[PDB]
Amino acid sequence: XXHXXXX
Amino acid sequence: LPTPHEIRNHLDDYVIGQEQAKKVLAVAVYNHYKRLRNGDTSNGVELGKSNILLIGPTGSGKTLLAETLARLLDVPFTMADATTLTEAGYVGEDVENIIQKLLQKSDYDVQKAQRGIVYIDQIDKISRKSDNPRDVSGEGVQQALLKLIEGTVAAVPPQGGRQQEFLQVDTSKILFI
Amino acid sequence: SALPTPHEIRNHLDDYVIGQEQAKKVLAVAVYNHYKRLRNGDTSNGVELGKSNILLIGPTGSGKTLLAETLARLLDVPFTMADATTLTEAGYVGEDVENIIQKLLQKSDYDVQKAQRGIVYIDQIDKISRKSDNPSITRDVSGEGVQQALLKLIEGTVAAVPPQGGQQEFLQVDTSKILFICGGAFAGLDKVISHRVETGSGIGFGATVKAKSDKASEGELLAQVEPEDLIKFGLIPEFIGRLPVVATLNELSEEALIQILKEPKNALTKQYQALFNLEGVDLEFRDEALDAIAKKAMARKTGARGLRSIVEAALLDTMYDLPSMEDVEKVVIDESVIDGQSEPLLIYG
Amino acid sequence: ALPTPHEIRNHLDDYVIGQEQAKKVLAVAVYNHYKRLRNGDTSNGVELGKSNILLIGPTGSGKTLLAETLARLLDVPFTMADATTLTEAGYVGEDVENIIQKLLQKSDYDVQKAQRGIVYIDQIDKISRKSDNPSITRDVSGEGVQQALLKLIEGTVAAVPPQGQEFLQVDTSKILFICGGAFAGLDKVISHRVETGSGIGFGATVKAKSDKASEGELLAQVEPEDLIKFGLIPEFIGRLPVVATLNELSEEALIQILKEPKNALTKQYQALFNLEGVDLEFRDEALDAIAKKAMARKTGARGLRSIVEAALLDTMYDLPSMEDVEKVVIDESVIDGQSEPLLIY
Amino acid sequence: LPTPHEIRNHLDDYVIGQEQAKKVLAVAVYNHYKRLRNGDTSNGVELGKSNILLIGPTGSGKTLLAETLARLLDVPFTMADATTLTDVENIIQKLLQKSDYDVQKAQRGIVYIDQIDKISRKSDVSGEGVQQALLKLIEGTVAAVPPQGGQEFLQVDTSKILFI
Ligand SMILES: Nc1ncnc2c1ncn2[C@@H]1O[C@H](COP(=O)(O)OP(=O)(O)OP(O)(O)=S)[C@@H](O)[C@H]1O
Ligand SMILES: Nc1ncnc2c1ncn2[C@@H]1O[C@H](COP(=O)(O)OP(=O)(O)OP(O)(O)=S)[C@@H](O)[C@H]1O
Ligand SMILES: Nc1ncnc2c1ncn2[C@@H]1O[C@H](COP(=O)(O)OP(=O)(O)OP(O)(O)=S)[C@@H](O)[C@H]1O
Ligand SMILES: Nc1ncnc2c1ncn2[C@@H]1O[C@H](COP(=O)(O)OP(=O)(O)O)[C@@H](O)[C@H]1O
């Protein structure tokens, strides 16, 4: 569905 | 038909505080139409494309110039938005829809639509920010728009169909702001 | 319907594992008691029969992952073998916790009533643990956060899984009676426990110096493991409370390796015998060579898995030219061959 | 039929120069891989184990060459991925499952055929735990990838989108992995440990270390504990029991690689000259000079192309236009640039 | 079909002040394209794959050389950048966007990269990320690319594709 990207 | 002296005066009636910008638009607007009067018939080959890039702060009259120009100019005008634009049309919109709205203003007149003007607001919205990625409003939008801005014929169903046919409306002639 | 007993199931696992009597006893009681809780499907006076998960702790290559694999063979009820490195906290790109339940249904053929009574195994559980203390200003998405999500899963709840890939419907599967066996290899746990128990000091005059005479990491620094020790390692009390039982596995001893080469049906030596048999040459291992391999293996400190390096490298030169050779009835490996001083002896016909 | 280890060694011999020990490992490994497929499930022995390969050597030694040339005569599915891209799950960089994706494409989406394939990994040294690093931090690039790969090498099932909202399960226990890469500073690590054991005081004895560089022979004495100091995890090393040591190219290795291989630049350049009808010959004086320049620059075999290209850069401009030139001779002066090559009519 | 002398004249028509650069591209392009014609019929199989590197001050026409050459030879050319990279797939699909359908026609295309010094290894995730990643790209490989965005994936070889 959506997008997730982090660190 | 286009006049750079008079057009500057006409914009002055509706816009104030930007004198240099009026001179720039009059040259590009005059040059773009002059090119189409005699298309690629001059001796000069590989003529540079005439386009416009508006850059100014908030409340500077960017949206205002598009409205005033549309009223003064005879060819049909359109006012689109980049936020609605999405790549590969998942649920938001498609780039080809911009051409459909242009025909509605031109009443499905290809000869009259190719000489139209295009203005896209919030150009910064399509800025590619893919540091942490898929991206539907970033590179995908700019890539599709660049293909259209380059000049290509795109299939557009005229009237939607009652046919399985589409018209190959040119794009290099149409101007973009 | 006579179910197996711990002595019977232990005999099966004993055929595949050696020197793990402490840990094998735990799996037998759980599997044994798991059928009792299953038989009493809300048909007993005692409602909400307690649950007792298992935590298999052991060194590298000690056979933790091997126990769960061999267990599934003789097990009638379903089983699974998942991991935790690919798990992410609440919807990240990596994976969701519901993927574990999807695997269980593939083995049970999407049988909800049959999958709820299944068993679950997880590997590398220690990897998902915040190394830092409680503050954790940066929000790690693969550390202790993953453990927090599993709390609802272990306690018992219902998740959403599409059937066979899809309808706009989902399947609710309870986890109240589903067992979990989270086994992982913990590194540096011996140092943390020494500070709490040994409390050694040797600078001052009054304080006594141990002089490197303390117990080994596996000898006495694993059996007396307590929840409070794991908090310093980075686990959350809430996660450990869900796993009361603990199983401590000792490091493979010199004598243990000798048995592992011969007693198991899947031992490496047996595998080479079958592989060499296909070529047509018999394989015989001398007793001197077997013990020598054990001495070399311990130096590597890689566990049972390190044994393959010693055997394969030693016989690499032999396997390279054995197919070309013809009418070779037998192949025997001498003690010197393990060291590499001398080449193996071959018999021709 | 099935190729024998000797049979496959001679095939690699044409494309591989100066690597004797490495050919034996890949030959025995690949040969064993076939038996495990056939003998497996049709022999008294059951649950046949697996053994992977770990290639270690300097840069430009031919590690990447072995992975490609082997696939030509093998005919089974093969792939090539990079570890550096891989990152711990849940992060922006990449995921470990990606590696499986490429393998399927090479097998035309054949799960039964992809499990029987081979995989190679380059630049493996870039993922090592940083001993000297702040405690509170996470090496998703180096440590996370290793942790995630542990279960993959042992054998398991991972979700894979078929063809790139459904996934396909593909076993991995039968799949083979060949990790390889240059390890900078490893020579000092191994040297220390094997020669560490001596004090500085009067009573303490002194070892006679540092007798020889032993670059080609020091990597051969590698052990798993030496890699722990480097940054590798003991669990990851256990998954790769076999080890391979590739020495640096010899002073005259470049000379042999120029002539003996069928894919050498000399033969390749001759093909370009041959189609035009002009023969191309390289003398011994010219070739040895190039070898000295290559080693002096320390670029390696990879940089060898530059020397040949520059030497013929000016001359190649007019060869097609020129006529009545049946043969061309290359001289040492031509490589140096002192004089132009002579034309034979 | 062209020759190094003829291409040099054509190159001089639109470019000036760079004489040594013309001879480099003429032989490299002529030889590289020659490989496509001969293929593997010759004894020297597995030939080709020679990359071109350009180092010069800004405004020297480095990009113009590729674009002018692409027009002279009528070969598709794309102008990608490495500064954006921290994807690799974007570079491959980019070239395909010229015609959106190429099996044995995009393999002979040319690509140009700008600001190659940015990726220099500082001594630092910003640098050295790209160089290790570009190794497999330059050495040749095949990457999945959805043609036109869409349900069948397309495989395109990269070894034939030349890089500048
Ligand atoms: N240059 C201007 N001269 C006079 N009035 C202006 C000017 N710019 C904005 N205004 C006033 O502000 C109103 C809205 O102006 P807009 O053009 O919509 O502002 P804008 O910042 O150009 O919009 P954006 O940023 O392109 S969405 C107009 O109806 C005017 O009343
Ligand atoms: N008790 C044992 N008896 C026989 N072989 C064993 C034993 N323990 C380990 N092995 C061997 O070691 C291999 C790997 O066992 P594993 O279960 O993976 O050990 P491990 O401690 O679980 O490693 P991890 O947990 O993945 S770090 C097995 O396939 C056997 O060949
Ligand atoms: N040992 C070798 N024997 C023969 N040719 C070699 C050797 N090493 C390199 N070459 C030549 O140099 C080319 C490049 O070699 P590579 O396989 O890239 O070396 P490398 O050590 O694998 O580099 P990496 O993998 O990036 S560390 C080969 O295609 C051969 O032409
Ligand atoms: N010799 C030349 N003749 C004509 N135009 C040139 C020449 N050299 C550079 N240019 C101009 O420079 C522009 C390209 O600059 P470029 O080489 O891309 O700069 P940079 O290398 O800094 O990116 C083109 O628009 C082109 O018109």
Residue extents of the structural domains in chain D:
1-247, 248-345
Q: Is D91 on the interface with A (CB under 8 A)?
A: yes
Q: Which residue of D lies nearest to B131 if distances are taken between CA atoms?
A: D92
Cα torsion through D188, D193, D198, D201, rounded to 10: 60
Q: Do D238 and C277 make contact, defined as CB atoms within 8 angstroms?
A: no
Ligand nearest to the CA of C71: 2
CA distance D108 to D105: 5
CA distance D286 to D156: 55
Q: Is D306 on the interface with E (CB under 8 A)?
A: no
Mutational pocket test of ligand 3: of D13, D17, D64, the residue with most ligand atoms within 8 Å of the beta carbon: D64
Residue B121 and residue B58 in contact, taking contact as beta carbons nearer than 8 Å: no
CATH code of residue B31:
3.40.50.300
- Of all protein residues, the one whose alpha carbon is nearest to atom 26 of ligand 2 is C65
Q: Considering only CB atoms, which chain D residues are within 8 Å of B133? A: 92
Ligand nearest to the CA of E15: 4
Ligand nearest to the CA of D62: 3
Q: Is B131 on the interface with E (CB under 8 A)?
A: yes
Identify which of D82, D141, D272 has the shortest CB distance to residue E136: D82
CA distance E80 to chain D (A): 20
Write out residues 220-239 of C within 8 Å (CB-CB) of D. Answer: none
Q: Considering only CB atoms, which chain D residues are within 8 Å of E85? A: none
Q: Is B133 on the interface with E (CB under 8 A)?
A: yes
Q: Is E63 in the pocket of ligand 4 (CB under 6 A)?
A: yes
CA distance C161 to C157: 13
CA of E96 to the centre of ligand 4 (A): 25
User: Would you state the structure tokens that stand for residue D196, as one six-digit string?
Assistant: 């560490």
Phi, psi (5° rounding) for residue D177? -135, 135
Identify which of D85, D317, D321 has the shortest CB distance to residue E133: D85
Q: For domain D248-345, give the fold.
A: Helicase, Ruva Protein; domain 3 (1.10.8)
Q: Which residue of B lies nearest to D92 if distances are taken between CA atoms?
A: B132
- The secondary structure element, H or E, covering residue B101 is helix B97-106
Residues in chain D that come right before a backbone break, where C and next N are over 2.5 Å apart: 164
Q: Is D66 in the pocket of ligand 3 (CB under 6 A)?
A: no
CA of B33 to the centre of ligand 4 (A): 28
> Measured in whole angstroms, how far is the alpha carbon of residue B89 from the centre of its chain?
20
Q: Is B83 in the pocket of ligand 1 (CB under 6 A)?
A: no
Q: Is D301 in the pocket of ligand 3 (CB under 6 A)?
A: yes
CA distance B131 to chain D (A): 8
> Measured in whole angstroms, how far is the alpha carbon of residue C20 from the centre of its chain?
12
Residue D273 and residue D280 in contact, taking contact as beta carbons nearer than 8 Å: yes
Tell me the CATH number of domain C251-349, given options 1.10.8.60, 3.40.50.300, 3.60.9.10, 3.40.50.2000. Answer: 1.10.8.60
User: Would you state the structure tokens that stand for residue C2, as one six-digit string?
Assistant: 């006579």
Q: Which residue of D lies nearest to B134 if distances are taken between CA atoms?
A: D92
Residue D119 and residue D79 in contact, taking contact as beta carbons nearer than 8 Å: yes
Q: Considering only CB atoms, which chain A residues are within 8 Å of B132? A: 5-7
Method used to solve the structure: cryo-EM
Q: Do E87 and B133 make contact, defined as CB atoms within 8 angstroms?
A: yes
Do the two chains D and A touch, given a threshold of 8 Å on CB pairs and at least 3 pairs?
Answer: yes
Exposed (0-12), middle (13-18) or buried (19+): which is C133, by Cβ within 10 Å?
exposed
User: What three-state secondary structure class fits B119?
Assistant: strand
Q: Which residue of E lies nearest to D267 if distances are taken between CA atoms?
A: E44
Q: Is E120 on the interface with B (CB under 8 A)?
A: no
Residue E89 and residue E145 in contact, taking contact as beta carbons nearer than 8 Å: yes
Q: Count of CB contacts below 8 A, A vs C?
A: 6
Q: Is D92 on the interface with B (CB under 8 A)?
A: yes
- Of all protein residues, the one whose alpha carbon is nearest to atom 6 of ligand 1 is B61
Mutational pocket test of ligand 2: of C66, C300, C302, the residue with most ligand atoms within 8 Å of the beta carbon: C66
Q: Do D45 and C99 make contact, defined as CB atoms within 8 angstroms?
A: no
Class of the CATH domain delimited by C2-250: alpha beta
Identify which of C85, C131, C274 has the shortest CB distance to residue D148: C85
Looking up tokens 């001759």 gives D270
Residue E34 and residue D272 in contact, taking contact as beta carbons nearer than 8 Å: yes
Ligand nearest to the CA of D15: 3
D171: which strand partners?
A: D157
CA atoms within 13 A on the CB side of D78: 16
Exposed (0-12), middle (13-18) or buried (19+): which is B74, by Cβ within 10 Å?
exposed
Cα torsion through C340, C341, C345, C346, rounded to 10: 60
Q: Count of CB contacts below 8 A, A vs B?
A: 7
Atom of ligand 2 nearest to the CA of C249: 21
CA distance A4 to C144: 19
CA distance D91 to chain A (A): 6
CA distance C139 to chain A (A): 8
- Of all protein residues, the one whose alpha carbon is nearest to atom 1 of ligand 1 is B61
| HEC profile of chain D | CCCCHHHHHHHHHHHCCCCCHHHHHHHHHHHHHHHHHHCCCCCCCCCCCCCCEEEECCCCCCHHHHHHHHHHHHCCCECCEECCCCCCCCCCCCCCCHHHHHHHHHCCCCHHHHCCCEEEEECHHHCCCCCCCCCCCCCHHHHHHHHHHHHHHHCCEEEECCCCCCCEEEECCCCEEEEEECCCCHHHHHHHHHHCCCCCCCCCCCCCCCCCCCHHHHHHHCCHHHHHHHCCCHHHHHCCCCCEECCCCCCCHHHHHHHCCCCCHHHHHHHHHHHCCCEEEECHHHHHHHHHHHHHHCCCHHHHHHHHHHHCCCHHHCCCCCCCCCEEEECHHHHHCCCCCCEEC
Atom of ligand 2 nearest to the CA of D154: 18
CA distance C237 to chain A (A): 25
Q: How many domains does chain B contain in total?
A: 1
* Structural domain containing residue B169: 1-177
CA distance C58 to D94: 30
Atom of ligand 3 nearest to the CA of D181: 27
- Chains near C, with 3+ CB pairs < 8 A? A, D
| HEC profile of B16-80 | CCCHHHHHHHHHHHHHHHHHHHCCCCCCCCCCCCCCCCCCCCCCCCHHHHHHHHHHHCCCCEEEE
CATH of the domain spanning D1-247? 3.40.50.300
Q: Is B62 in the pocket of ligand 1 (CB under 6 A)?
A: yes
CA distance E54 to chain B (A): 26
Q: Who contacts E75 (Cβ-Cβ below 8 Å, separation ≥6)?
A: E69, E108, E109, E110
Ligand nearest to the CA of E116: 4
CA atoms within 13 A on the CB side of B105: 22
User: Would you state the structure tokens that stand for residue B167, as one six-digit string?
Assistant: 């018209």
Q: Do A6 and D92 make contact, defined as CB atoms within 8 angstroms?
A: yes
Q: Count of CB contacts below 8 A, C vs D?
A: 147
Identify which of B87, B128, B131 has the shortest CB distance to residue E86: B131
Architecture of domain E1-164: 3-Layer(aba) Sandwich (3.40)
Q: Do D82 and E135 make contact, defined as CB atoms within 8 angstroms?
A: yes
Q: Who contacts C278 (Cβ-Cβ below 8 Å, separation ≥6)?
A: D35, D38, D39, D43
Single out the residue of D255, D318, D311 nearest to residue D285, CA to CA: D255
CA distance A5 to E124: 20
Q: Which residue of D lies nearest to A1 if distances are taken between CA atoms?
A: D165
CA of B48 to the centre of ligand 4 (A): 15
CA distance D283 to D258: 11
